[PDB]
């Protein structure tokens, strides 16, 4: 059901992306892409659209990096304690004071360190003077996953609830078992019990709530998710966490709302889009009920333009020769129009491959020599402003081109519009109806995605009052402005 009557030049594009399909010719998948970003192809084999399934994003479930990984099942135990644990070549104390090594194996309790230098000799066969390697702390590892198995399979209160859990669940008891032992996991009697009747926002509670977790929370609240999600999400990108998790289609289609709203038009067309491909990557089952075909992926659909290079391509070349300054001030205004979307979305991911140039008495406007397209949005509308402004910049900033002080043309443009209360109000809505359409939309994140773009906008209406540069918006302290 892919309609969009407001925009029947979008939907005609899309027309041909089906019927492509009907005719076998399929969205290939662009190899330095995402493994979930492909090329959307029309009946003459040419390029229309890069189409972006939400189950293919790199958090993807449908992802096909992470695919080998989901796998392994319970075998993800190794990679899981490994980043729970790190790894250590010499003597450390864990979190409760006692001697370890390797990856989280404890020595003693005792707080004498040739206790532990000893009864390290007597596990790696050698006098190890309390340093060992990688082999070595390998192989201690093995065994005290073994242990753990064991400790969980050998007792009464922890092996039925074991039994009853899903591949990833176990791992995530094991996971329990090996930093607290055998016995000590079998005291919270009350979430194996809810464990066991399989309700997770039960049980996710009560671990929430433990001497451990207590001492470890970072630890515990990743696995007391892996409890209730059934899944690694956790242990994949731990963390961006700027960001809702699996919405990036969302972003993309949403930098192309603001972009309609705010008229830039440096935003090529993008919005919700299902497509069915069989060069998509779906589940085996998915495959086998076609024999009724594949199901289409809900995904972003950015219209495809032509005639243009890399950001970077072109600047590198306006350096060495600069452009007469009639055509670089028509540069300037494009980039005026970047800076305003990234900085109202608050894009935290735009280098210089992000975004694209293109360089070539009346009725009628002569045509640009000079103009940008902004591509790749589906990591904007971050939950939160990010920790170090240095992990999650704006790359612009640095730029030359960040130092002139914003045009007339685009407080004109722009200072209306944000200045109008009921702007904001109607673009607040019109993202809220693109957002609620996901399964996994939540009203309070949204709240605080809402709240980061309403203090980005309350900057940049100051920022466009005062003339200041892009360089001197940035550098404003960012503000929330919270219901
Ligand atoms: N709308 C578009 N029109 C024309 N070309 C595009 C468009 N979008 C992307 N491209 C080209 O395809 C490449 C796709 O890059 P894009 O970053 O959008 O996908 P991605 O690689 O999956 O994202 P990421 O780099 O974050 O993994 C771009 O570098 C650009 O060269
Ligand atoms: N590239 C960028 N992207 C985003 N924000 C930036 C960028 N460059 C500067 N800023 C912002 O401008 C401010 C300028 O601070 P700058 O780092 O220049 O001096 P500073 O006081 O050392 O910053 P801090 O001590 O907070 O790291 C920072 O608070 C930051 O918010």
Redesign the pocket.
């Given at each position: 059901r892919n309609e969009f009557p407001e925009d029947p030049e979008f939907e005609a594009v899309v027309r041909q992306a089906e019927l492509a399909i009907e005719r076998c010719i399929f969205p290939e998948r662009?190899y330095?892409?995402?493994s979930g970003?492909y090329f959307v192809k029309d009946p003459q084999g040419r390029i229309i659209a890069?189409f972006?399934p939400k189950n293919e994003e790199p958090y993807g479930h449908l992802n096909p990096k992470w695919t080998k990984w989901l796998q392994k099942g319970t075998g993800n135990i190794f990679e899981m304690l490994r980043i729970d644990e790190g790894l250590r070549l010499k003597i450390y104390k864990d979190t409760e004071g006692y001697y370890t090594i390797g990856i989280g194996h404890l020595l003693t309790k005792s707080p004498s360190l040739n206790a532990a230098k000893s009864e390290l000799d007597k596990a790696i066969g050698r006098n190890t003077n309390g340093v060992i390697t990688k082999d070595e702390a390998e192989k201690l590892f093995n065994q005290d996953v073994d242990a753990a198995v064991r400790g969980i399979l050998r007792n009464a209160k922890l092996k039925p609830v074991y039994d009853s859990l899903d591949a990833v669940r176990r791992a995530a008891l094991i996971n329990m078992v090996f930093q607290m032992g055998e016995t000590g996991v079998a005291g919270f009697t009350n979430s194996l019990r809810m464990l066991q009747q399989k309700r997770w926002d039960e049980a996710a509670v009560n671990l929430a709530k433990s001497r451990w977790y207590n001492q470890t929370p970072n630890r515990a609240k990743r696995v007391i998710t892996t409890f209730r999600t059934g899944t690694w999400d956790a242990y994949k990108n731990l963390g961006r966490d700027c960001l809702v998790l699996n919405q990036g289609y969302l972003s993309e289609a949403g930098a192309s709302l603001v972009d309609q709203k705010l008229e830039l038009n440096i935003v090529?067309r993008t919005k919700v889009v299902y497509l069915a491909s069989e060069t998509f990557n779906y589940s085996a089952i998915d495959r086998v009920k076609s024999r009724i075909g594949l199901p289409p992926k809900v995904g972003s659909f950015?219209?495809?333009?032509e005639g243009?290079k890399d950001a970077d391509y072109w600047l590198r070349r306006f350096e060495a020769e600069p452009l007469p300054e009639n055509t670089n001030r028509q540069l300037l205004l494009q980039f005026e129009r970047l800076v305003v979307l990234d900085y109202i979305i608050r894009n935290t991911?735009r280098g210089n491959?992000?975004w694209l140039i293109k360089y070539d008495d009346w009725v009628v406007v002569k045509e640009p020599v000079i103009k940008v397209?902004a591509?790749?949005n589906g990591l904007a509308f971050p939950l939160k402003h990010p920790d170090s402004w240095r992990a999650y910049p704006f790359y612009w900033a640095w730029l030359p081109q960040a130092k002139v002080p914003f045009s007339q043309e685009i407080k004109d443009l722009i200072l209306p519009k944000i200045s109008d209360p009921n702007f904001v109000k109607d673009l607040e809505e019109d993202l809220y109806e693109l957002f609620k359409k996901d399964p996994g939309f939540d009203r309070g994140q949204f709240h605080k995605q809402i709240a980061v773009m309403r203090g980005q906008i309350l900057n940049l209406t100051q920022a466009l009052k005062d003339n200041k540069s892009p360089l001197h918006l940035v550098q404003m302290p960012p503000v929330i402005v919270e219901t």
């Open positions: 662009i330095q892409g995402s970003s890069v972006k090529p950015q219209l495809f333009v243009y991911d491959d992000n397209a591509i790749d």
